[PDB]
Motif scaffolding. Structure first.
Motif, short mmCIF file in Angstrom:
data_model
loop_
_atom_site.label_atom_id
_atom_site.label_comp_id
_atom_site.label_asym_id
_atom_site.label_seq_id
_atom_site.Cartn_x
_atom_site.Cartn_y
_atom_site.Cartn_z
N UNK A 1 35.66 22.53 38.22
CA UNK A 1 36.32 23.79 38.49
C UNK A 1 35.51 25.02 38.05
N UNK A 2 35.79 26.15 38.70
CA UNK A 2 35.17 27.42 38.37
C UNK A 2 36.25 28.48 38.35
N UNK A 3 36.32 29.24 37.26
CA UNK A 3 37.21 30.38 37.20
C UNK A 3 36.40 31.57 37.71
N UNK A 4 36.98 32.34 38.62
CA UNK A 4 36.33 33.51 39.19
C UNK A 4 37.07 34.75 38.71
N UNK A 5 36.37 35.64 38.02
CA UNK A 5 36.99 36.83 37.45
C UNK A 5 36.64 38.06 38.26
N UNK A 6 37.66 38.80 38.66
CA UNK A 6 37.46 40.01 39.47
C UNK A 6 36.84 41.19 38.73
N UNK A 7 36.68 42.30 39.44
CA UNK A 7 36.08 43.51 38.90
C UNK A 7 37.15 44.36 38.19
N UNK A 8 37.01 45.68 38.23
CA UNK A 8 37.96 46.58 37.56
C UNK A 8 39.13 47.07 38.42
N UNK A 9 39.44 46.35 39.49
CA UNK A 9 40.50 46.78 40.38
C UNK A 9 41.36 45.64 40.93
N UNK A 10 41.51 44.58 40.13
CA UNK A 10 42.37 43.46 40.48
C UNK A 10 41.81 42.50 41.52
N UNK A 11 42.69 41.62 42.00
CA UNK A 11 42.33 40.56 42.90
C UNK A 11 42.35 41.05 44.33
N UNK A 12 41.23 41.60 44.78
CA UNK A 12 41.14 42.19 46.11
C UNK A 12 40.53 41.19 47.10
N UNK A 13 40.49 41.53 48.39
CA UNK A 13 39.98 40.54 49.35
C UNK A 13 38.55 40.03 49.13
N UNK A 14 37.68 40.85 48.55
CA UNK A 14 36.31 40.42 48.25
C UNK A 14 36.29 39.27 47.28
#
Length: 238
Positions: free
Chosen positions: A44-57
């Motif tokens: 498994x891999x946890x993917x952490x978003x940027x400074x604006x939440x879970x967006x489509x990118x």
């Protein structure tokens, strides 16, 4: 491949789930993506978003991880304030209102959840961008069993905590990203002084956010190269 992955791609299976974060925001929503054809347990891999939440990118990145053969979980850091609001400006404003410790804990809790996930092997890696690169480093400090960490242009780990790191680190930096790069030499010196396993790459002529294909800072050549290196790292350590 660093290509965008259609949400309907038959080689992946995506669904929203909730998982517990007792020291964060309680029941946290996340986008979970698995390889569609899996016989045995999968890393498994946890993917952490940027400074604006879970967006489509970021959701697309999770699908790219699953296309590469791993179970990917991308938590929603805005879950306590209604979720990604539909635009990055509002996302940025909302993320600032979320308690930083509880938010980070949500991502730590996602690591733990993926460690115990029945269809997973127990090994968990982490990757993230911007804010998420910072969380990736912090996770390397906190979890001695973390299989690997791959921060993209994110805050360095605190120098005094570097000795605690056991996860092999793959760090991607943008040449023009002076605010983040300022702290790299101290981090590198501590990694070397403590004989830590790492590889770091500085991509010339690009700035922070070069992997984000939804922004003008996107650079295909650097993005693709960084991603290829990331997949090799996963293959080696997961």
């Amino acid at each position: 491949s660093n290509a965008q992955v259609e949400f309907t791609d038959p080689e992946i299976f995506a669904e929203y789930i909730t998982y517990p974060s007792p020291n964060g925001h309680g029941e946290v929503r996340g986008y979970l993506v698995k390889p569609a054809k899996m016989s045995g347990k999968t890393p498994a891999v946890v993917v952490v978003h940027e400074n604006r939440g879970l967006n489509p990118y970021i959701e697309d990145v999770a699908r790219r991880v699953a296309k590469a053969g791993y179970i990917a979980l991308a938590p929603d850091g805005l879950n306590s304030v209604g979720g990604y609001p539909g635009n990055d400006d509002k996302g940025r404003e909302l993320q600032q209102q979320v308690d930083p410790t509880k938010l980070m804990n949500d991502f730590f809790a996602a690591i733990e959840f993926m460690q115990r996930y029945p269809q997973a092997t127990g090994k968990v890696g982490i990757t993230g961008f911007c804010y998420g690169g910072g969380v990736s480093n912090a996770a390397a400090v906190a979890y001695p069993e973390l299989a690997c960490a791959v921060p993209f242009y994110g805050r360095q780990a605190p120098t005094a905590d570097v000795a605690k790191i056991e996860a092999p680190l793959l760090l991607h930096f943008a040449e023009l990203d002076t605010r983040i790069n300022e702290g790299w030499p101290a981090y590198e010196a501590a990694l070397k002084a403590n004989n830590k396993v790492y590889e770091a790459y500085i991509y010339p002529g690009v700035n922070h956010g070069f992997h984000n294909d939804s922004t003008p800072r996107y650079d295909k050549s650097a993005a693709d190269l960084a991603w290829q290196r990331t997949l090799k790292w996963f293959d080696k350590y997961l």
